[PDB]
Amino acid sequence: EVLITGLRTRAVNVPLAYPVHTAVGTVGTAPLVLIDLATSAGVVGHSYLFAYTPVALKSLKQLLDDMAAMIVNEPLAPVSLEAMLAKRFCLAGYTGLIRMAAAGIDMAAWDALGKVHETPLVKLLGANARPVQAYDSHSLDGVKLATERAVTAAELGFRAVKTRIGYPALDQDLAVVRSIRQAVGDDFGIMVDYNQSLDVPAAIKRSQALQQEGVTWIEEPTLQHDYEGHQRIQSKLNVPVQMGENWLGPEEMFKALSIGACRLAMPDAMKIGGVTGWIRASALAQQFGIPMSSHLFQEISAHLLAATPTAHWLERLDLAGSVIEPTLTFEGGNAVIPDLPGVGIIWREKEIGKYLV
Amino acid sequence: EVLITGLRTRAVNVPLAYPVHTAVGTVGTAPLVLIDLATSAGVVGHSYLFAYTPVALKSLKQLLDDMAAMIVNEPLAPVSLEAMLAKRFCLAGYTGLIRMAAAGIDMAAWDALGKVHETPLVKLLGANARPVQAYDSHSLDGVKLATERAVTAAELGFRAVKTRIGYPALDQDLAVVRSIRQAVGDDFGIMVDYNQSLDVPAAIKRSQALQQEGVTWIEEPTLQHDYEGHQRIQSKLNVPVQMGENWLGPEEMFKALSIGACRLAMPDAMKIGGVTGWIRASALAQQFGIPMSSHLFQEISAHLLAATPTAHWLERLDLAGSVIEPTLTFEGGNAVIPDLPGVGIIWREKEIGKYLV
Amino acid sequence: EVLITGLRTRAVNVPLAYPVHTAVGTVGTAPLVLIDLATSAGVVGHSYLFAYTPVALKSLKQLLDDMAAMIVNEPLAPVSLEAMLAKRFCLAGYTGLIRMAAAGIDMAAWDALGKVHETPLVKLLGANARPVQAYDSHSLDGVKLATERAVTAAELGFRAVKTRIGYPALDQDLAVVRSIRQAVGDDFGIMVDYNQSLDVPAAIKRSQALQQEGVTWIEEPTLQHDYEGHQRIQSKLNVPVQMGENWLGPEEMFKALSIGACRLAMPDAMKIGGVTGWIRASALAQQFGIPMSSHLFQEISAHLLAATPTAHWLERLDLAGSVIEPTLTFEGGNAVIPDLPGVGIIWREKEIGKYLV
Amino acid sequence: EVLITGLRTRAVNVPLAYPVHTAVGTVGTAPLVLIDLATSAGVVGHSYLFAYTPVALKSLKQLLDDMAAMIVNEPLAPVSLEAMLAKRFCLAGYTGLIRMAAAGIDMAAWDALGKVHETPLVKLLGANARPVQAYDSHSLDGVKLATERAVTAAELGFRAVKTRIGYPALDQDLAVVRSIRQAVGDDFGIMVDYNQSLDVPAAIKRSQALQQEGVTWIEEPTLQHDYEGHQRIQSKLNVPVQMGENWLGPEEMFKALSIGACRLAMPDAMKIGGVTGWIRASALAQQFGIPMSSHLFQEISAHLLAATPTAHWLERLDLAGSVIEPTLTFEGGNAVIPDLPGVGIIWREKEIGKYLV
Ligand SMILES: O=C(O)[C@@H](O)c1ccccc1
Ligand SMILES: O=C(O)[C@@H](O)c1ccccc1
Ligand SMILES: O=C(O)[C@@H](O)c1ccccc1
Ligand SMILES: O=C(O)[C@@H](O)c1ccccc1
Ligand SMILES: O=C(O)[C@H](O)c1ccccc1
Ligand SMILES: O=C(O)[C@H](O)c1ccccc1
Ligand SMILES: O=C(O)[C@H](O)c1ccccc1
Ligand SMILES: O=C(O)[C@H](O)c1ccccc1
Ligand SMILES: [Mg+2]
Ligand SMILES: [Mg+2]
Ligand SMILES: [Mg+2]
Ligand SMILES: [Mg+2]
Known part of the structure; x- marks a missing residue:
């Protein structure tokens, strides 16, 4: 047909x-x-x-x-x-x-x-649309710009930011985290991403100092493919280890979860295998007891997370904004699915x- | 809406x-x-x-x-x-x-x-309709009736039957299996169900004698809830152990698979949590490497298995035939989804x- | 006969x-x-x-x-x-x-x-009657009422209370615990129940902050059926994790104990399988080294715990008081078995x- | 420089x-x-x-x-x-x-x-050139052609052939193996490749029947990425399980070896990461106790295997023969490194x- x-x-x-x-x-x-x-x-x-x-x-x-x-x-x-x-x-x-x-x-x-x-994708998957909390994703910006960007995010209503760290010295990573905190207050979430840049011992050391600062999560501290190495870093932390943006298919996520590599997951809609892969990854996350967030593809992720039992955060990083209409809106720091059939992507x-x- | x-x-x-x-x-x-x-x-x-x-x-x-x-x-x-x-x-x-x-x-x-x-349920789940091989499920019938019923099944086109065993003596279980085989030839599948009736040592002994006969699978040899006990029986068999009809929710299936209790699974659409539970169980089966069959609810199972990556067999056991139209048909031993919206259940x-x- | x-x-x-x-x-x-x-x-x-x-x-x-x-x-x-x-x-x-x-x-x-x-049930089981320490079980009451109710309990002689927590913010859970402590002094036990309301990472975080406060136990922090998830939270705590009210039969308790899900158990006389199930659960608790308390059914639990090797606490929550005579009495915070044949339940x-x- | x-x-x-x-x-x-x-x-x-x-x-x-x-x-x-x-x-x-x-x-x-x-690559890596036993790799050819091709291979001096199997019926896989055996005698090696085409239970069943026939190895019986599933099939076989052609980098081989997925390995020079990846994979193979063969790239593999402690077989499959001079020669079923600097690849x-x- x-x-x-x-x-x-x-x-x-x-x-x-x-x-x-x-x-x-x-x-x-x-x-x-x-x-x-x-x-x-x-x-x-x-x-x-x-x-x-x-x-x-x-x-x-x-x-x-x-x-x-x-x-x-x-x-x-x-x-x-x-x-x-x-x-x-x-x-x-x-x-x-x-x-x-x-x-x-x-x-x-x-x-x-x-x-x-x-019908909107979310409804075709059998769930209702609901707003999803989102955090604004920034980069390796330095103390001044990172602070600046966080202040704007809180101004726009977000209640959490992700900064990338991994400066040459630990002391630089902390300067940034502290400056953000001071400008945004103690409620605010502050996620930090190492982007695979540390070896295991260096990860345990820097992570424990950060845990003392108060971050929301520690993301990809070491090579993405070393599951066992993520499990070792996680074993010495209270704060959770986050990862998953680099899993190619749910069969890679299954391997990392089977070993206890992390306490949070954040599959990437594209690498995880699309809508079909995500539904699969969501079932796994549910059974292993892991809160699941998204990585990029904010348009379709808003729909995907609404149908996800352990949904946790939506990552706001607007890659395609220049060529798509802004049908996804953020209100009060929550992404709002638009009421349009499919995913709601309309080209400019x-x-x-x-x-x- | x-x-x-x-x-x-x-x-x-x-x-x-x-x-x-x-x-x-x-x-x-x-x-x-x-x-x-x-x-x-x-x-x-x-x-x-x-x-x-x-x-x-x-x-x-x-x-x-x-x-x-x-x-x-x-x-x-x-x-x-x-x-x-x-x-x-x-x-x-x-x-x-x-x-x-x-x-x-x-x-x-x-x-x-x-x-x-x-739209038919199968298509709403994103898959195409395809016929599913089915086996005719019989009971603890004795040599004569079990043989009789198998012959009819092959006459109707099925290429496999499930018999229930667990007589007082092992020798009775085997008599039945052999009589069926003789009347249906060596190609034919013969599944056998113990319905939880043996203790682990008795299961290992009877199963090894049956494995020598040539059965397709050995189903629920001991108490359904003793996962670890199923794993012990499976550890001494080449033939696979089947189970799953009694899992209440995918979180029970997850527990049994995590331990290696069996090599085949056969969730029951009702106990597994409906369509929503099944989709979840199918993702798990895929990742653990387990072929997945159905238990009862042949109407909706035909649709569910078509969308199931590791689909294996459909169990033909017509419970509701007296009060529903026969829209599901079997042709050539394969169940054929009818082309009607939903599951295709229409009351009489x-x-x-x-x-x- | x-x-x-x-x-x-x-x-x-x-x-x-x-x-x-x-x-x-x-x-x-x-x-x-x-x-x-x-x-x-x-x-x-x-x-x-x-x-x-x-x-x-x-x-x-x-x-x-x-x-x-x-x-x-x-x-x-x-x-x-x-x-x-x-x-x-x-x-x-x-x-x-x-x-x-x-x-x-x-x-x-x-x-x-x-x-x-x-003869009283306790004696038929082969043990002597002995008083059992009991704690008064309250609800998700807010700082004022929770404090009020604790003060009354200490007034009535109890030496421990159970409060339910799990407010939207961790800071609310702690306010309650601290207000109780201030009014009851440092000796006093304060048990806290999450009623399955947190995910694992949130459980580890809130539990560690509470452990610092001084609670007696942390009960059901996450979904009751996720044993493995309780074991993960317990692995990062000194304070013990309590659970067991939702085990259906000793074969579910066996599964959770086999994995180290908790350090305290509190079977529910009804869900555990009655007197027959309890005797079974008590043997398991003894061998795994776990102190065992009761959940509801205070009348029969008083008798059951006296015959329980690792008995720990009796939960005072009077569900049936309106329709039964008050033969069970509490004196000095200890439940006292009445001297009447059977369990001592007499209808009004x-x-x-x-x-x- | x-x-x-x-x-x-x-x-x-x-x-x-x-x-x-x-x-x-x-x-x-x-x-x-x-x-x-x-x-x-x-x-x-x-x-x-x-x-x-x-x-x-x-x-x-x-x-x-x-x-x-x-x-x-x-x-x-x-x-x-x-x-x-x-x-x-x-x-x-x-x-x-x-x-x-x-x-x-x-x-x-x-x-x-x-x-x-x-200098020839082999010598730059620090080893001497030595001939390497090679087997001729054929395809899913049917009884007649598979037999024909095996006879030619023995005529050319090879002492082992690889056939691909996985016909619809097990009985077809065996027909082929037996016909080859009859024409080549009992000394001769016969390797068989399933190319990932079976589920675990079907793999255990077909493999045990083949083991009884007398094959040299059973290669890629199930999805390449399911390590754990290969380990399950291997656990029920005496004959070894072979795999490795699909490992992308030694970090995937490390994962499969860490779990006992197979008893033989056969990295593919391209997927394993080239000469640099191979040297790495060879160190791993040595420590895990695994004989290591090659997959395709016969020109460079001849050199690579000579420097490989656990070298086992060279796979003869000439992909680039049409556009390269034939400097690699096979004599007596052994590949012979040519004495030319580098790998010895010269375009036509x-x-x-x-x-x-
Ligand atoms: O998690 C994230 O957002 C980063 O790791 C990231 C990775 C790749 C592209 C953009 C952003
Ligand atoms: O697998 C089966 O079909 C049997 O275990 C079965 C169990 C319960 C009702 C009917 C049939
Ligand atoms: O432990 C307890 O008392 C609570 O979990 C509880 C649960 C269900 C009914 C009443 C009380
Ligand atoms: O091992 C082998 O040779 C086969 O798996 C094979 C795979 C891919 C291309 C050619 C050959
Ligand atoms: O640094 C990164 O995140 C990465 O290289 C990147 C991110 C976003 C756009 C382009 C490139
Ligand atoms: O024996 C059984 O399978 C079970 O009791 C049963 C099966 C089918 C219908 C009614 C009852
Ligand atoms: O909240 C609860 O504890 C539960 O719903 C409950 C408890 C006691 C009586 C009735 C209902
Ligand atoms: O079947 C295969 O081996 C594969 O598709 C292939 C092999 C060799 C050349 C081309 C393609
Ligand atoms: Mg990242
Ligand atoms: Mg059954
Ligand atoms: Mg409770
Ligand atoms: Mg191959």
């Missing part, structure tokens, strides 16, 4: 509202691939993929264009499509870029499904034209 | 096409509760619950009638409804009869959801009137 | 001396089922069941009335009766409402046994008439 | 000497990317990457072309280069296509290193021109 009839992809480099500071330098643009999934019913599903670095952007788009042939003419049934792709790529390696690509199709396919039934065609690669 | 506006329940005692023989005696009827879930959209969701024994039938219906007040006027959103009930019953004990009842509402609620969107009002309790 | 000859049940809604405050609102009545077990010897055993919510009350009574047929004419031998019921319900699910019902019959059957031999027929449902 | 000065890549689709039969159909060509790594010393390193499917070929080449900018002007020091890339891709995901690409550069970089020092420029994509 409803068939997929085409796939069109466009690679852009969009400006970021909040340039992200890093050890290297400032990055003011995001490399995205926009996807349009056409169907025999006259509706188009939409989604986007984040490439992380301009180095992979063209390659990601080419991969997607080359896979269009496997999905054109298949029924618009995301669970069954996902099983087919996992089988086609079983030798090449259903992970990395290939898995991300497939996740792109899944999210667009679900968006079209919601449109066929004229005019602008996309400017950033085309 | 779509609200639940009423709940009506009717308790019946229906005749069984295949009287089930047991150690005690023959049972020719099934105690069911039919549920009708009305909604503000003009559609009615339907489902049924199996009470196992007439002893619990009135109590089950009374429980459901008494909970109608908590769900009337709530939005028709099964995932969110399920979370609310788990919270209302957190002190009483969200398990047993209460959990079964809630599972009744979930299945009816999902059936209504499929009707609101005029006329007959229900006869079996009313 | 002594046979069971009848079962009569009456469902009531009794007033509580101490209205229990909850997040939802105040509850001033308890839904109970009273049971009378008649015997061929001319004696009647008595017991009661607590239904938790009015939603389950009629269903519980109907279940009991429907099972009377299986026990009428059986010998008055509680251990053998319990084995028979566990076998009749092996498919339906010997847990939840069914298990509670069976536990009702067990307690009444033991009460009749004590009456046949004209007059009043029961008022609360009948 | 020696700098990398350029990277040129060419995507080809080469004919295979031995068309590979699969469940789907016959594939007569291999999608490869050839890499030329230029250096300031006047030497060019060469290597190739296998893309598995034409779907990923253009994307792989584009990725490599886009990363050339990060390596141009860096010193020709493969260990240090590899650390730099692992750090650049730490957010995107250093695995999948990105990891394969980086592995392409590593192998070419090592080939150039051997050329700068005018003329032909490459024909297969260019």
